[PDB]
Write an enzyme that holds these catalytic residues in place. Structure first.
Site, short mmCIF file in Angstrom:
data_model
loop_
_atom_site.label_atom_id
_atom_site.label_comp_id
_atom_site.label_asym_id
_atom_site.label_seq_id
_atom_site.Cartn_x
_atom_site.Cartn_y
_atom_site.Cartn_z
N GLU A 28 0.76 2.15 112.25
CA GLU A 28 0.32 3.57 111.71
C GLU A 28 -0.47 3.41 110.38
OE1 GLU A 28 4.40 5.69 111.42
OE2 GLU A 28 2.88 7.41 111.99
N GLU A 30 -3.57 5.96 107.62
CA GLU A 30 -3.80 7.38 107.32
C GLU A 30 -4.79 8.02 108.32
N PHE A 31 -5.76 7.40 109.03
CA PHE A 31 -6.77 7.59 109.91
C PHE A 31 -6.06 8.07 111.45
N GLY A 32 -5.09 7.17 111.66
CA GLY A 32 -4.17 7.49 113.04
C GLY A 32 -3.31 6.32 113.23
N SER A 33 -2.99 6.43 114.36
CA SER A 33 -1.61 5.55 115.19
C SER A 33 -2.34 4.82 116.26
CB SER A 33 -0.51 6.52 115.44
OG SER A 33 -0.01 7.32 114.41
N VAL A 34 -1.74 3.90 116.62
CA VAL A 34 -1.57 2.91 117.75
C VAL A 34 -0.41 3.01 118.68
CG1 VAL A 34 -2.53 0.82 118.84
CG2 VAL A 34 -3.54 1.67 116.77
N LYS A 48 -0.73 -1.14 131.98
CA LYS A 48 -0.25 -1.15 130.59
C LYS A 48 -1.63 -1.02 129.55
CE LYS A 48 2.86 -2.90 127.11
NZ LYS A 48 3.69 -4.07 126.65
N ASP A 149 -18.32 -3.53 110.69
CA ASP A 149 -17.01 -3.82 109.87
C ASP A 149 -16.25 -5.02 110.88
OD1 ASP A 149 -14.49 -3.53 108.49
OD2 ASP A 149 -13.60 -2.12 109.86
N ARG A 153 -9.65 -9.43 111.72
CA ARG A 153 -8.59 -8.28 111.83
C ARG A 153 -9.13 -7.26 112.95
NH1 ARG A 153 -11.02 -7.20 106.85
NH2 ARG A 153 -12.45 -5.08 107.18
N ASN A 154 -10.43 -7.32 113.29
CA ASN A 154 -11.13 -6.58 114.05
C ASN A 154 -11.44 -7.22 115.55
OD1 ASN A 154 -10.92 -3.80 112.98
ND2 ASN A 154 -12.62 -4.40 111.80
N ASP A 167 -12.63 -2.70 116.87
CA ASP A 167 -12.77 -2.04 115.71
C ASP A 167 -11.75 -0.92 115.76
OD1 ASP A 167 -13.95 -0.85 113.43
OD2 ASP A 167 -15.67 -0.23 114.16
#
Ligand SMILES: O=C(Nc1ccc(Oc2cc(NC(=O)C3CC3)ncn2)cc1)Nc1ccc(CN2CCn3ccnc3C2)c(C(F)(F)F)c1
Length: 268
Positions: A28, A30-34, A48, A149, A153-154, A167
């Site tokens: 989770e 601010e921009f959204g969730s996975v 999946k 970016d 982490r990406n 991304d």
């Protein structure tokens, strides 16, 4: 025509919402969730997937950008399976990707320094991760696409241990991009050199002892990321070339990928 190619890409990217089932939240922000999910395929079986959730003009920009991403076809670039648009009591855009059990590369490097996580990562595997990222970036840069970016982490790890660019950050931004809005492929080259350093230090945050607000002045005085302890001299020369003051002096992704492949082959 240019319009015909756009309308073609556009029809292919939308997935019918009834073919998707949503599971548990994985992350989770601010921009959204996975979330994890199930996608019903053409052959009758389910796959999946990972589902990322996030005005007409903004939705149109999202669909346009998703159509371009689905068109990418390279083993070192994450594949976009499609998109869904949900509706709240505000439109909710969703992006569908294959599920990767090993997750992001930054977390994986950190876990490898702990007893229950993946085993110690040898030098040869760390270089192979760098070659994989260079291959994905070479594909994108040749098609005049800018990442903006790039960081460990990406980058995602596939089940066969292949790395792909994805991304879901002052310390990754090129010197010319901090002084003016200017952003080229040579700016992604700078971000790549910083990513190589994150891999070589096994997940360290760039520039220890240097604060985010004192970054532009630090670089303006000619200082760069220090050579990691077990990093070969030849590898450091490659990452240092990514941080040359003049963007024109920096190598292209194609030149970098070949230097990295030659270094890996020379190892015993
Ligand atoms: O990669 C993307 N989304 C994404 C990726 C992983 C994810 O999460 C997961 C998670 C997991 N697994 C787990 O978490 C396991 C451990 C528990 N497996 C799979 N996936 C959820 C969403 N999207 C994406 C967006 C933009 C761009 C490039 N540009 C587009 C247009 N554009 C315009 C201006 N700037 C730009 C930027 C790119 C590209 F690849 F091309 F680089 C990709």
């Amino acid at each position: 025509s240019h319009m015909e190619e756009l309308q073609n890409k556009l029809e292919d990217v939308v997935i019918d919402r009834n073919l998707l089932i949503l599971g548990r939240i994985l992350g989770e922000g601010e921009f959204g969730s996975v979330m994890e999910g199930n996608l019903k395929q053409e052959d009758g079986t389910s796959l999946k997937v990972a589902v990322k959730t996030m005005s007409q003009r903004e939705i149109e920009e999202f669909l346009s950008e998703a159509a371009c991403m689905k068109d990418f076809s390279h083993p070192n670039v994450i594949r976009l399976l499609g998109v869904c648009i949900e509706m709240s009591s505000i439109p909710k855009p969703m992006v569908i990707l294959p599920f990767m059990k090993y997750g992001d590369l930054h977390t994986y490097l950190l876990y490898s320094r702990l007893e229950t996580g993946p085993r110690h990562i040898p030098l040869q595997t760390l270089l192979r991760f760098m070659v994989d990222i260079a291959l994905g970036m070479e594909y994108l840069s040749n098609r005049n696409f800018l990442h903006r970016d790039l960081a460990a982490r990406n980058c995602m790890l596939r089940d066969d241990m292949t790395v792909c660019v994805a991304d879901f950050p002052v310390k990754w931004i090129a010197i010319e991009s901090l002084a003016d809005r200017v952003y080229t492929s040579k700016s992604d080259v700078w971000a790549f050199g910083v990513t190589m350093w994150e891999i070589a230090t096994r997940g360290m945050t760039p520039y220890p002892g240097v604060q985010n607000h004192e970054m532009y002045d630090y670089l303006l005085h000619g200082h760069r990321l220090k050579q990691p302890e077990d990093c070969l001299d030849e590898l450091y020369e490659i990452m240092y070339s990514c941080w040359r003051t003049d963007p024109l002096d920096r190598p292209t992704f194609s030149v970098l990928r070949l230097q990295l492949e030659r270094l890996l082959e020379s190892l015993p």
